[PDB]
Design a protein around this nucleic acid. Structure first.
Ligand SMILES: [Zn+2]
Lengths: 100, 38, 161, 49, 98, 75, 177, 42
RNA sequence: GUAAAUUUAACUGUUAGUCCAAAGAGGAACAGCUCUUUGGACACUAGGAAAAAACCUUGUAGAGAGAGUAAAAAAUUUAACA
């Protein structure tokens, strides 16, 4: 019943050796999440005469309150939300190389 | 209370006691024998 | 009912790490054969997809797979397009099975072949040395030769048993 | 390689961790004995001449 | 088509709907979508792992920023495995024919 | 001490050198004995011959083998 | 994992909320395990240039345990900048005035001294008691184990363990005790 | 014919991962009913 | 053991030095003090002592997204009493 690592989270590792002992065999089949460990997705979320037309709710906010709201929802600091000058905006490479 | 690096009893009534981190010498018979470890 | 070496359970009476019992070598020896045979049986039937192999080339270990590129900082004295075999393979792995060399796999177990596709010089490298107040200043530019290899195929053979 | 394996081959890295952990346990067992017991299965060393 | 995924070249609409039809041809019950992993659900940077289960058996698990996006990606994962166009598939054989 | 190192051919560090166990050579070694590691040379296969010059290899144990096959032991 | 390129990138660089229970735990050991999660040092894909840090939630920060006489000996000193503004308060004084200051300062001193340190402190949440806001509580993922194992009090031992432990001496019957 | 300039990586692979690229949930075990820490159901 | 040394020819340049270890002087058995001797380092690279000319590790020179190592992390909590 010996196991170097618990075969519960990632895979079932089974160490082995060859007859000559010149190669180590590692059979590690992937483990599947049991059906009993998951939660169902939350699918659910009158006398009206006028149709509910889409109403714009873009409230005007100053530079201060706008950054404070952003810094709380993304859990960052206010410093990154301030703009930068033209000198830095021109040094940025708009066509960077891409890998994979 | 006289501060002394080395605390020495000055009579048979002086007794050592450990209080507040430093040794003290108390002597009810002779109040001038009281000492505080420096 | 206490042995001469008995110690009552305290904080330091026993080692903090739990006791570990290794399997019986006689029992485990045949258990290894069962695992090796199962993995060997996965090779004859071709129950594997893409394979990644770790090879030792140019004093360097490359985690390469098929149809990828590797840049080598020296000339191999080989014409472009020639197909060669990388003899040293230290690790071959798949989605479900992995084989380890000690420290190298046998030539009868794994075969990795590459192709010379481009031989070019490196971009100019600046080598400059400067010392203050000593009038010591000299600049050197070097272009080390380079070679690009593309791994074509990584195939294994059922020789575990 | 190990850094690349730890990122792109998590299952292969766990196999190496199990091998290192097994070898680590073999040394502790050998340290408790006085050499009478044989060496561990993974503690064997391939000799090159 | 080496470093390109199946649906990166074959643009489709509603992969979840196409997954149901391919399971009907193989006599497979309708998959059930359930949440396997969850992180930052109340924040603006969430992560959902929706798992497709046929007869209480996991067939694919996919990530996403929202539940619908994660479910849509999980459907694409199942289709890739059914069609055999996974990233794990063996590379194309360019060797000389025997 | 620097001069004696040059006389013994020990310029590059971690480069084994073979010398004769004679009092005159030992006299130089006893001067720089704190800068070098001294090990005896052992010959399990004996002195290399003319046919074994190309197959020698000095192992870390101090033994000089005359058959460097680069092949795992079949035993 | 046969994912699409964008979902695969998002999952790898996602943020995971962790939970820490600070009751009867040293602040430094709490900070040591909180430091790596905040910096992202627990991920194999960690890099300084990549903001791979996570969120750490520490509860019961009021009931931390200080080893030795650190409640009385350790001093937290700060300067307001004005003359005579040099203030020095002990750990006990600071703990009563602010139950979360001790843990916050220990974690803040472990992060790298760079501009990213203040960003990592925004992803750290401290709560003096076991009460947690729903939004922060509804997005937790894993509860990291406590570093220090709390020793059991003498009244928490069951009779099975008390009777199992043998007595070492026989007291005299005439001893008043 | 490519420009003789600096090459960012000495290697280039289009399928770097075969067993699945690492994600933070790779090495985390699942709990019964997938409950969150200190969360009560029903 | 090693490969230099002397002589011949032709001239330039350096010699207002430092600190460390050691022996001994002057001062006060002070000085980052002064003055000799032996040796090292420095004005030649790099790593480590927090920053670091003089301590330790280490030299002969390039490229690498390889590897093995050198020096290299201060300890310590002390008073009863016939
Ligand atoms: Zn008195």
């Amino acid at each position: 019943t010996y196991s170097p690592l618990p075969d519960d989270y990632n895979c079932n590792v089974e160490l082995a050796l060859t007859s000559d002992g010149r190669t180590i065999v590692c059979y590690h089949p992937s483990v599947d999440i049991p059906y009993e460990h998951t939660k169902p997705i939350p699918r659910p979320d009158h006398d009206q005469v006028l149709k509910t037309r889409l109403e714009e709710k873009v409230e005007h906010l100053e530079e201060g309150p706008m950054i404070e709201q952003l810094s709380k929802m993304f859990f960052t600091t206010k410093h990154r939300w301030y703009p930068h000058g033209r000198y830095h905006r021109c040094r940025k490479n708009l066509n960077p190389p891409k890998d994979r | 209370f006289k501060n002394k690096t080395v605390l020495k009893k000055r009579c048979k009534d002086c007794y050592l006691v450990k209080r507040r981190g430093r040794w003290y010498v108390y002597c009810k018979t002779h109040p001038r024998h009281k000492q505080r470890q420096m | 009912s206490y042995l001469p070496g008995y110690v009552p359970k305290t904080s330091l009476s026993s080692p903090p790490w739990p006791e570990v019992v290794l399997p019986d070598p006689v029992e485990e020896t045949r258990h290894h054969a069962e695992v090796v045979k199962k993995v060997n049986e996965m090779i004859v039937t071709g129950q594997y997809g893409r394979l990644f192999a770790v090879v030792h080339f140019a004093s360097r270990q490359w985690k390469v797979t098929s149809e990828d590129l590797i840049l080598i900082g020296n000339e191999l004295d080989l014409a472009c397009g020639e197909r060669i075999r990388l003899e040293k393979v230290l690790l071959v792995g798949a989605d479900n099975f992995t084989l380890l060399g000690k420290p190298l796999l046998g030539k009868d177990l794994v075969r990795v072949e590459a192709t010379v596709i481009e031989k070019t010089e490196s971009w100019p490298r600046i080598i400059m040395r400067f010392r203050k107040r000593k009038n010591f200043k000299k600049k050197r530019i070097v272009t080390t030769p380079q070679t690009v290899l593309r791994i074509n195929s990584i195939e294994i053979a059922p020789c575990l048993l | 390689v190990l850094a690349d394996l730890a990122i792109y081959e998590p299952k292969t890295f766990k196999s190496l961790a199990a091998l290192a952990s097994r070898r680590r346990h073999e040394g502790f067992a050998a340290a408790l004995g006085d050499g009478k017991e044989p060496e561990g299965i993974f503690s064997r060393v391939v000799q090159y001449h | 088509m080496t470093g390109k995924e199946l649906f990166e070249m074959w643009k489709i609409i509603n992969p979840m709907g196409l997954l149901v039809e391919e399971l009907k041809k193989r006599n497979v019950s309708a998959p059930e979508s359930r949440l396997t992993r969850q992180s930052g659900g109340t924040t603006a940077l969430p992560l959902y792992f929706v798992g497709l289960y046929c007869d209480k058996k996991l067939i694919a698990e996919g990530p996403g920023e929202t539940v619908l996006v994660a479910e849509e990606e999980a459907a694409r994962v199942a289709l890739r495995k059914l069609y055999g166009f996974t990233e794990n598939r063996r590379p194309w054989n360019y060797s000389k024919p025997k | 001490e620097k001069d004696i190192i040059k006389m013994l051919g020990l310029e590059k560090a971690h480069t084994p050198q073979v010398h004769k166990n004679i009092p005159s050579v030992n006299a130089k070694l006893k001067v720089v004995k704190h800068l070098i590691r001294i090990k005896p040379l052992k010959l399990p296969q004996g002195l290399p011959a003319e046919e074994n010059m190309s197959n020698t290899c000095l192992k870390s144990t101090g033994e000089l083998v005359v058959q460097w096959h680069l092949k795992p032991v079949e035993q | 994992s046969s994912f699409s390129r964008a979902p695969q990138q998002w999952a790898t660089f996602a943020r995971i909320w962790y939970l820490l229970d600070g009751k009867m735990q040293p602040p430094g050991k709490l900070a040591a395990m909180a430091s790596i999660r905040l910096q992202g040092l627990h991920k194999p894909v960690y890099h300084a240039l990549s903001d791979c840090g996570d969120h750490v939630v520490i509860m019961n920060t009021r009931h931390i345990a200080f080893s030795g006489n650190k409640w009385e000996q350790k001093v937290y000193s700060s300067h307001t900048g004005y003359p005579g503004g040099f203030r020095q308060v002990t750990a006990a004084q600071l703990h009563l005035r602010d139950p979360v200051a001790i843990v916050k300062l220990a974690i803040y001193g472990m992060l790298p001294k760079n501009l990213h340190r203040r960003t990592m402190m925004e992803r750290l949440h401290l709560f003096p008691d076991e009460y947690i806001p729903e939004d922060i509580l509804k997005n937790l993922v894993e509860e990291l184990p406590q570093p220090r194992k709390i020793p059991k009090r003498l009244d928490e031992y069951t009779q099975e363990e008390i009777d199992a432990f043998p007595r070492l001496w026989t007291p005299p019957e005439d001893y008043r005790l | 014919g490519l420009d003789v300039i600096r090459i960012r990586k000495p290697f280039h692979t289009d399928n770097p991962s075969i067993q699945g690229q690492w994600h933070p949930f790779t090495n985390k075990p699942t709990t019964f009913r997938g409950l969150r820490p200190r969360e009560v159901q029903d």
